[PDB]
């Protein structure tokens, strides 16, 4: 994870306008819809069968807010993502056995959700900075596999 000073400003600047109550649920919801096999991990969330069901599922919205909060923690500790996500790495790998490739998929749909919400403010430069952050988080989460 590098993030030159300009990149850090681009990242933090945009993140201050993010509605963390909405974005998290939207990103998790789309993951469940676009990549169907991920639903296997959320058996306990109830009805996920259709796009509408996923998008109105209260557990999806609530867990999404939690996933988003973790990202906000990683953004404040960008230079020690590893330590910040050490405990969550153990969870996803040890107890959940989620293949790491899925970390990258969630990171990518999060990027699509941000683009969807910010329109042209999400410039090619802003996206590039976020691609670095998202790859950094996926990496830190996959650590307990390295």
């Amino acid at each position: 994870v590098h993030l030159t000073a300009e990149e850090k400003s681009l990242v933090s600047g945009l993140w201050g306008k993010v509605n963390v109550d909405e974005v998290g649920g939207e990103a998790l919801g789309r993951l469940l819809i676009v990549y169907p096999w991920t639903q296997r991990f959320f058996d306990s969330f109830g009805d996920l069968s259709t796009p509408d069901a996923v998008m109105s599922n209260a557990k999806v919205k609530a867990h999404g807010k939690k996933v988003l909060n973790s990202f906000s923690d990683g953004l404040k500790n960008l230079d020690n993502l590893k330590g910040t996500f050490a405990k969550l790495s153990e969870l996803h790998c040890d107890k959940l056995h989620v293949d790491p490739e899925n970390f990258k998929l969630l990171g990518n749909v999060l990027v699509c959700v941000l683009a969807h919400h910010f329109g042209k403010e999400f410039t090619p430069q802003v996206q590039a900075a976020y691609q670095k952050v998202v790859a950094g988080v996926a990496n830190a989460l996959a650590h307990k596999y390295h």
Binding site: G29, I33, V34, P51, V54, V111, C112, H116, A128
Partner: protein, 141 residues
């Protein structure tokens, strides 16, 4: 596979992009080059700076090939056969690159048409771009 709903979501979205397809092709390439530097390796003869006339012109050609695909959803292999040879045989593009570009193509459409970009449309478009990539890499397997 591409179900009737998918095809409808694909055609309907392209209709909305319309005259802007070429612009979008150029912007998606820009996003690809900036986000994933490894991709610039295939374009040493291009001036890879941001407004570049070479990038813009190439984006128009990529967008035109996708429009052709939209018109032939039932026969992508036939409609994209020549491009399959080009990419697999001549250029030898690493399959991983297709995912990278596909992602930036989705981000470009989300940036410009947030209203049409529903979860259902996002899923159909993803299926579309993956179907195109599969055909362009079919000579590897």
């Amino acid at each position: 596979v591409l179900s009737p709903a998918d095809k409808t979501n694909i055609k309907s979205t392209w209709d909305k992009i319309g005259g802007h397809a070429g612009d979008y092709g150029g912007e998606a390439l820009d996003r690809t080059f900036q986000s994933f530097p490894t991709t610039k390796t295939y374009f040493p003869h291009f001036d890879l700076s941001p407004g570049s006339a070479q990038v813009k012109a190439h984006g128009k050609k990529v967008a035109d090939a996708l429009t052709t695909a939209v018109a032939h959803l039932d026969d992508l292999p036939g409609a994209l056969s020549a491009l399959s040879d080009l990419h697999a045989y001549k250029l030898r593009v690493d399959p991983v690159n297709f995912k990278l570009l596909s992602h930036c193509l989705l981000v470009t459409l989300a940036c410009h048409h947030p209203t049409e970009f529903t979860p259902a449309v996002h899923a159909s478009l993803d299926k579309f771009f993956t179907a195109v990539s599969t055909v362009l890499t079919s000579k590897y397997r």
